[PDB]
Amino acid sequence: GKIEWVRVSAVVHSTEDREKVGEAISTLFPFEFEIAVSKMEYLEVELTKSSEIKKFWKNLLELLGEQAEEILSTLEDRIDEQNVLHIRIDKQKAYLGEVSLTSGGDPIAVKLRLVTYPSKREKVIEFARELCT
Amino acid sequence: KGKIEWVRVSAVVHSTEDREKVGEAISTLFPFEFEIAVSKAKGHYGNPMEYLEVELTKSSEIKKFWKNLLELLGEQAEEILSTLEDRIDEQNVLHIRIDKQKAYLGEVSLTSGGDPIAVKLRLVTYPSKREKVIEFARELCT
Amino acid sequence: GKIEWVRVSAVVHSTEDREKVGEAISTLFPFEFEIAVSMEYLEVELTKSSEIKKFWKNLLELLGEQAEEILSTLEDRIDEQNVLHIRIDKQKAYLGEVSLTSGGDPIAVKLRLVTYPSKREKVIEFARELC
Amino acid sequence: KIEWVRVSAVVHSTEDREKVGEAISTLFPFEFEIAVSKAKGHYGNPMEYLEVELTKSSEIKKFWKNLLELLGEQAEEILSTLEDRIDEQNVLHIRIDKQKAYLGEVSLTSGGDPIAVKLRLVTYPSKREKVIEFARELC
């Protein structure tokens, strides 16, 4: 299958500095991207060019390191009924340049749309196994 | 691509007005059963006002309702299309006001009049961009 | 100088309750009167000087301070056939208050003035009759 | 009381900043200053920002009264939506039609390029309904 798209987002609170929440986000990009600011506001990034998607991903696994193995263990609970694989990153650490997973409720959300032929949960789960490695 | 998070349909009832008569001009816009919240407050001047709002939050209704509205409105939907940029505010809400009177008589007509039936529709897209938004709204005019 | 007549008209849109419209018109009649039903219009006309006189009195009474505003603009309110115009808040009227309104849905109140002859000069003077 | 009043507007590459400023004039019954700057538009294009700030209740109150006056029966539309025009920073938003403003007329606008008119609403007991009701007061 393939990765239809990649969506990265985060939330900015009243006591939070937007530029800072965006700096935390730029930590997940090895190339230029664009952030969309909306209104408590949202910072939203998207990836459609397969090149960038493919390049973003390989880079994310590289920066995750050993944590890339913990995704695998959870692929089943991470992928939803719309075949979107969800990966929660630590906002604060990312700000500090570090890429790490988090179970917290205010993470930098990374979402990937998976497409298999056809979209069979057993296929998507496997495409992701191969993917996270 | 995107969705209409919600839909709000409202009108005002003046001292000389009949709630039931108005509630009817409201229903002209609906092809299915619906509720109607009723608030009260002092109008622009000091006159006691009555507010009537109908909000659709079930995708189901939203879409059937929007298909209908477009159905009824018909040939004016092209005007909605050429004037999109002046109907959608910076909060991504699409605004459509109908002639309250012609409505009472089951006729949907866009109006610039001072006392119409306001129809807002929140449109949401990813990313949330004026661009992605206007593109979506332009689609809604199926 | 006399008031030939006095007629008070109002309108009722599809969404309006014709009765509530009329209960707002009666706010200016200190006596019996009938409504001529012609959206639809509602009219009333006074021909007896008594009523025409009772109407004008009670009118300025209710307007109060506002009676001075009219007193300001006669040349304008007075039309060609020496007919004087007063439009008032239909909404406040229904509540029981007379207020001139620039609004676009008033309760029009006009009355023809008659001078001898109806010279636009002496007519305006008679119009300023206010006290 | 009303903390501050700020009237801003945007200028696109193909627009005349003089014309845009004139349209802002339509809103003032007294002399004012326009503070220029740079920005991005809804489509990400290089824009010029024009803002006017009022702090003196003198000018403030005079402004609001006039504004309300010019608006006329249109203020009924504001009141029926009062909640939305109010953000969590307690600012009252009244969005004015730029083009009509330029043609010297004051009207509301539902589009995405108005002449923004914001108001910092302050209630001694400072709450949601506190300001929301205070808004009504300005009628």
Numbering used by the authors:
A (entry chain A): 4 to 42, 51 to 144
B (entry chain D): 3 to 144
C (entry chain C): 4 to 41, 51 to 143
D (entry chain B): 5 to 143
Show the paper's wording.
UPF0201 family proteins constitute one such uncharacterized, archaeal specific protein family. The UPF0201 family proteins occur as a single globular α/β domain with approximate dimensions of 55×35×35 Å3. The protomeric structure consists of a five-stranded, anti-parallel β-sheet, five α helices, which are located on one face of the β-sheet, and three loops connecting helices and strands. We have further documented that all members of this archaeal specific protein family share a common polypeptide chain fold, which is evolutionarily related to the RRM motif found in the ribosomal L5 proteins and many other RNA-binding proteins.
